[PDB]
Amino acid sequence: VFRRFVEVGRVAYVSFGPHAGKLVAIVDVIDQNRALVDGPCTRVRRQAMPFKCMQLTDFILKFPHSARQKYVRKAWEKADINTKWAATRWAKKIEARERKAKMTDFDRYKVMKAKKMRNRIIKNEVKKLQRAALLKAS
Amino acid sequence: MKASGTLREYKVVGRCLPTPKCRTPPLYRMRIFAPNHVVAKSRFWYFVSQLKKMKKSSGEIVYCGQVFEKSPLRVKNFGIWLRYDSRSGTHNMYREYRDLTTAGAVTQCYRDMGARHRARAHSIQIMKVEEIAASKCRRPAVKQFHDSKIKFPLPHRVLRRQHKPRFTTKRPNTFF
Amino acid sequence: SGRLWCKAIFAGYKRGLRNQREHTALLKIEGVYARDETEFYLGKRCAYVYKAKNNTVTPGGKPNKTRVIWGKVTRAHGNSGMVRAKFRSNLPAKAIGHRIRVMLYPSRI
Amino acid sequence: MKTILSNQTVDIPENVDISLKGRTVIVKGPRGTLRRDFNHINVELSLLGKKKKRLRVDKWWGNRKELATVRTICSHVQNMIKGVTLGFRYKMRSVYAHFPINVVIQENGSLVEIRNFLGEKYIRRVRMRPGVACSVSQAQKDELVLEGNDIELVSNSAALIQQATTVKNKDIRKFLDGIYVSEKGTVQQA
Amino acid sequence: QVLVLDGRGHLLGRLAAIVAKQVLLGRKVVVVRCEGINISGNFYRNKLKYLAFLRKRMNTNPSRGPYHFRAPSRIFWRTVRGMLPHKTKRGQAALDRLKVFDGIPPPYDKKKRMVVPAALKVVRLKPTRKFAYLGRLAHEVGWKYQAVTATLEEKRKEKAKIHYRKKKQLMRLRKQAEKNVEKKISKFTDVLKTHGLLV
RNA sequence: UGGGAUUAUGACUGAACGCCUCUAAGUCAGAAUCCCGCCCAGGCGGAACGAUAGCGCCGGAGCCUCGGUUGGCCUCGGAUAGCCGGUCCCCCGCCGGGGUCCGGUGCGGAGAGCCCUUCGUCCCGGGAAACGGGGCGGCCGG
RNA sequence: UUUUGAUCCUUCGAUGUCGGCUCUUCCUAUCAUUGUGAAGCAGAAUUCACCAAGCGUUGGAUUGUUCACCCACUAAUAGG
RNA sequence: AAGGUGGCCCGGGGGCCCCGGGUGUUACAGCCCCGCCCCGGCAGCAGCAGCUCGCCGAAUCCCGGGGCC
Ligand SMILES: [Mg+2]
Ligand SMILES: [Mg+2]
Ligand SMILES: [Mg+2]
Ligand SMILES: [Mg+2]
Ligand SMILES: [Mg+2]
Ligand SMILES: [Mg+2]
Ligand SMILES: [Mg+2]
Ligand SMILES: [Mg+2]
Ligand SMILES: [Mg+2]
Ligand SMILES: [Mg+2]
């Protein structure tokens, strides 16, 4: 039950390769397994790129199938995609992933202490709730 | 000739050297697809040898240059004419591929001829390469792509980085 | 007051099909599967432990039964996180499929 | 080659009320219900439109082998509609030369005893499939009538009785005996 | 310290290689639910392959001859022998590390058990291709205990449902608690979101 | 002395090839053949049970011998051309399931994960706890 | 490769050389039996072909004979 | 000129708006080619918009790390 379709104008997130972590629009189709791609505002050159590597989102900035890079830059700024991106939850769990790699040892210790406490509180409240449901039953 | 990596296109010209009979022989140009100027010069000599009274020793090569793609970001539909040797017999072809560059296309031809006919690279001679317009394109695999509102999904998505866990709990999904 | 060493397994010696050159040894370290990754461990002091019947000395303490063979991680091996290592005395083949304690303290930082 | 796309629509009438859990289809109407599993086939079954007027069935990136599975579905669904609304009356006449075939029905048209075939003492206790109603017609001497919704089960049970009454070791070109299908039709016409 | 591999929807050789290499590196593997195993290629030819292996017997005194194990467990074990040097001692101690069960007995029913995706049917075969269950194969070729393992699994399945329900029940109470108290555990969650621990 | 799955073969529905068509996906009947049962032996394979000779249990000291290890994760079931968690005003079952409807979905109700943490001791204050920690008899599950 | 021939690599300080008797297993290129297709197949009788080698394939006169020919029963008196 | 954007006509989906089909040449979307405006003019340049395509260093040098003796 397909929801996202490869349509000229659709935005894709680059999984791996040289241009990792970058957003980019599908300009055109060559064949079954190879497409013309360009992302002017994110510092990615006009180039070929196979569908294998990419994984498409639910945004479709509108432009003609052969439109030269000018009209794309204007349409991109016009829609203001980058901000809606940063609003998406996706990017947030990406930044979390990265902060977790960046995790310092001192922060790691402060975090362990925070966990320890937050979980003792939860344990207390949950046990009172279970006795409460028994009280409700009784 | 092994077609390693991806070909270039080279503009070779050459001639027979002067003689007392004829002081200024005519120049001859070709369009060699080849990885480098060394194998280019060799193949040039083979074709000239097939057509004209001319060897490498009796002559000299005047100029070998690389020739760039003058329109590399436009997409094109190339039309190739062939000449191949079967196990038994020889046969002419006309084949249409859909690529951006002459070199990328010629590569794709080599790989297709290899798949579909087990034709080894040495047997094959390239005789004409013409960029051809969508109107004049005959083959339906090409013809189907000329449509403004092309649309298709990615249905079954085989996983890559299979071994990076090698051992998980959750069975992997492939539907998004 | 905890584990101060990374785990490695003695997979086997350096060898062709019908000849093994046992002066060198192959390690398979836990949780490391690329040549990018193995650049950290370079230079590190490995240490094969074992225990024997009779009582031996122990530096800074009374005599224990435990003994050791010290070694050293020479260079990477292969493309999938295996690693060569050369120990001061040649290893016994009994140890195939056992634990060695790569320490940390020739740091390359 | 890999054909980018095929599809084919079936515009259904308003009487029927289909629904689907993915591939498994369910169809209800007057005569009854009909479920049918397609999990082996691998296609997109979109049920679009108000008044449920049409079914559409996509098939992305198919080769010659995979294109054949579209129209086969279209037809299986259409026959399913016939089976729910109208039904299926399979007529079949008992041909014989000399010895008359004494036929009799057991279990309200579920089972069929067939005696005196070529004067054989063996008797053929043929069992119909579930959801099938055998019946001897009136106003006809040699006439079975098999009624039901599912054409598959009906027709298989027909062939069961047909191949059951088969002449072994004999010239079949001459000995033209046995039951044979004559007229396939429906219970109520349209 | 025990790798517990589920067998369903796995491919016989794709798996067995991965096992053998771990075993040889000391890791204590335990395979389970082998009826789930499914091999590529249609049924009939897989049956031809097996009945050929049965025809191959020692003529003078069959009791000595090659032992044709019918049980799916012992079959998988056999093919592992094939990927091992079973004449040596180190190979025997390997096989001693291995431990196989058909179905799923009590000691292992209480364990979260791992799954190899790199030997999985959905991945490696094209959807159009045909496949065959090892349990069905064995049953037609002699296995005498098909129904029993089924009716024991069903009791396990129901007895599993109840635990899973009580776990969900705990998650509901837990989210509701976190919701009530949040005001006096806001700062801690704040640092967990600074270091990307809670988003 | 009795079964099963099937071969050769005859057949159903049904496209590819607007029709046709045993096949392409799918389905049916089918036999001295094939496998098993009935029958013969019973594994460096297990079983419940009985009897228990100076002895079996029950609760300190040194002192021989074999070595390896150097934190735990206590569980739905299954699908992948679709799933998970919610709710149901509506329909069944002994509270379980079902449909409508709301949230997630390159999985974050994440195994790229979750949990436990050990330097020790002394005073005092501040927050959380007070229905909790730890020390004896009964009640549930296999 | 069950005939026959062509060859000489192995063994001449020795591989016991023809036939019959007895006995096991094995191959299938199916003589008969089981199931089925086709016939210039009405039935009977008889021919050709597919799956199939699990179970059967005789008693005697003459000849050292293997081979050959003949009498008698048979469902059949197939071949290695 | 067209792999046809707005406009026009037919449908199909809603009661002015959305989706298919048909002519057609810029109109509130574009593409293609020739000529003339100091190779039209501006940085930058085999481009850290850390991989659109190469061959090289008398036209090239520096720093660091490991191993063995
Ligand atoms: Mg050897
Ligand atoms: Mg010790
Ligand atoms: Mg049967
Ligand atoms: Mg068959
Ligand atoms: Mg059947
Ligand atoms: Mg000789
Ligand atoms: Mg001798
Ligand atoms: Mg002798
Ligand atoms: Mg045969
Ligand atoms: Mg006859």
PDB file of C-alpha atoms in Angstrom, chain C residues 8-81:
ATOM      1  CA  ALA C   8      40.530 -11.626  22.420  1.00  0.00           C
ATOM      2  CA  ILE C   9      40.370 -15.178  21.147  1.00  0.00           C
ATOM      3  CA  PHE C  10      43.269 -17.193  19.761  1.00  0.00           C
ATOM      4  CA  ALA C  11      41.823 -18.295  16.484  1.00  0.00           C
ATOM      5  CA  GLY C  12      44.886 -19.860  14.945  1.00  0.00           C
ATOM      6  CA  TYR C  13      48.324 -19.395  13.528  1.00  0.00           C
ATOM      7  CA  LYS C  14      49.462 -17.797  10.318  1.00  0.00           C
ATOM      8  CA  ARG C  15      49.191 -20.464   7.664  1.00  0.00           C
ATOM      9  CA  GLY C  16      48.727 -21.425   4.114  1.00  0.00           C
ATOM     10  CA  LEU C  17      46.723 -24.486   3.236  1.00  0.00           C
ATOM     11  CA  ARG C  18      49.360 -27.099   3.986  1.00  0.00           C
ATOM     12  CA  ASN C  19      51.865 -25.191   6.049  1.00  0.00           C
ATOM     13  CA  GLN C  20      51.563 -23.218   9.293  1.00  0.00           C
ATOM     14  CA  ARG C  21      54.176 -20.723  10.474  1.00  0.00           C
ATOM     15  CA  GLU C  22      53.407 -20.838  14.177  1.00  0.00           C
ATOM     16  CA  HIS C  23      55.842 -18.168  15.339  1.00  0.00           C
ATOM     17  CA  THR C  24      53.015 -15.731  14.527  1.00  0.00           C
ATOM     18  CA  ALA C  25      49.515 -15.837  15.980  1.00  0.00           C
ATOM     19  CA  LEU C  26      46.023 -14.687  14.957  1.00  0.00           C
ATOM     20  CA  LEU C  27      43.650 -12.853  17.279  1.00  0.00           C
ATOM     21  CA  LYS C  28      39.913 -12.312  16.873  1.00  0.00           C
ATOM     22  CA  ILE C  29      38.988  -9.419  19.124  1.00  0.00           C
ATOM     23  CA  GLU C  30      35.440  -8.970  20.346  1.00  0.00           C
ATOM     24  CA  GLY C  31      33.365  -6.201  18.781  1.00  0.00           C
ATOM     25  CA  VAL C  32      35.728  -5.025  16.050  1.00  0.00           C
ATOM     26  CA  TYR C  33      35.082  -5.780  12.383  1.00  0.00           C
ATOM     27  CA  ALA C  34      37.063  -3.376  10.225  1.00  0.00           C
ATOM     28  CA  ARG C  35      40.554  -2.217   9.408  1.00  0.00           C
ATOM     29  CA  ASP C  36      39.538   1.310  10.345  1.00  0.00           C
ATOM     30  CA  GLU C  37      38.734   0.018  13.788  1.00  0.00           C
ATOM     31  CA  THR C  38      41.945  -1.901  14.315  1.00  0.00           C
ATOM     32  CA  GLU C  39      44.124   1.215  14.183  1.00  0.00           C
ATOM     33  CA  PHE C  40      43.454   1.845  17.873  1.00  0.00           C
ATOM     34  CA  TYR C  41      44.819  -1.442  19.236  1.00  0.00           C
ATOM     35  CA  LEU C  42      48.214  -1.087  17.532  1.00  0.00           C
ATOM     36  CA  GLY C  43      51.188  -1.466  19.827  1.00  0.00           C
ATOM     37  CA  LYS C  44      49.289  -3.009  22.694  1.00  0.00           C
ATOM     38  CA  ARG C  45      50.653  -5.558  25.171  1.00  0.00           C
ATOM     39  CA  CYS C  46      48.786  -8.851  25.133  1.00  0.00           C
ATOM     40  CA  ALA C  47      48.974 -11.411  27.893  1.00  0.00           C
ATOM     41  CA  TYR C  48      48.079 -15.112  27.747  1.00  0.00           C
ATOM     42  CA  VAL C  49      47.314 -16.441  31.217  1.00  0.00           C
ATOM     43  CA  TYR C  50      47.414 -19.965  32.497  1.00  0.00           C
ATOM     44  CA  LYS C  51      47.544 -22.009  35.689  1.00  0.00           C
ATOM     45  CA  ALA C  52      49.780 -24.948  36.529  1.00  0.00           C
ATOM     46  CA  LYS C  53      50.060 -27.630  39.202  1.00  0.00           C
ATOM     47  CA  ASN C  54      53.070 -26.302  41.152  1.00  0.00           C
ATOM     48  CA  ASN C  55      53.432 -23.096  43.102  1.00  0.00           C
ATOM     49  CA  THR C  56      55.281 -20.231  41.458  1.00  0.00           C
ATOM     50  CA  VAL C  57      56.359 -16.744  42.381  1.00  0.00           C
ATOM     51  CA  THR C  58      54.066 -13.764  42.039  1.00  0.00           C
ATOM     52  CA  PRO C  59      55.445 -10.212  41.828  1.00  0.00           C
ATOM     53  CA  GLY C  60      54.204  -8.259  44.846  1.00  0.00           C
ATOM     54  CA  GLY C  61      52.657 -11.063  46.807  1.00  0.00           C
ATOM     55  CA  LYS C  62      52.948 -14.636  47.871  1.00  0.00           C
ATOM     56  CA  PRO C  63      53.527 -17.460  45.352  1.00  0.00           C
ATOM     57  CA  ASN C  64      50.510 -18.381  43.233  1.00  0.00           C
ATOM     58  CA  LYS C  65      49.928 -21.194  40.821  1.00  0.00           C
ATOM     59  CA  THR C  66      49.104 -18.808  37.977  1.00  0.00           C
ATOM     60  CA  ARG C  67      51.637 -17.971  35.298  1.00  0.00           C
ATOM     61  CA  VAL C  68      51.783 -15.876  32.140  1.00  0.00           C
ATOM     62  CA  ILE C  69      53.150 -15.500  28.623  1.00  0.00           C
ATOM     63  CA  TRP C  70      53.446 -11.892  27.528  1.00  0.00           C
ATOM     64  CA  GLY C  71      53.010 -10.776  23.912  1.00  0.00           C
ATOM     65  CA  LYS C  72      52.500  -7.885  21.506  1.00  0.00           C
ATOM     66  CA  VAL C  73      49.960  -6.897  18.840  1.00  0.00           C
ATOM     67  CA  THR C  74      52.041  -6.498  15.718  1.00  0.00           C
ATOM     68  CA  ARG C  75      49.827  -5.155  12.954  1.00  0.00           C
ATOM     69  CA  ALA C  76      46.439  -5.642  11.394  1.00  0.00           C
ATOM     70  CA  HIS C  77      45.540  -8.791   9.497  1.00  0.00           C
ATOM     71  CA  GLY C  78      42.974  -8.884   6.788  1.00  0.00           C
ATOM     72  CA  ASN C  79      40.029  -6.722   6.024  1.00  0.00           C
ATOM     73  CA  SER C  80      37.537  -7.982   8.628  1.00  0.00           C
ATOM     74  CA  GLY C  81      39.069  -7.114  11.983  1.00  0.00           C
TER      75      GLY C  81
END
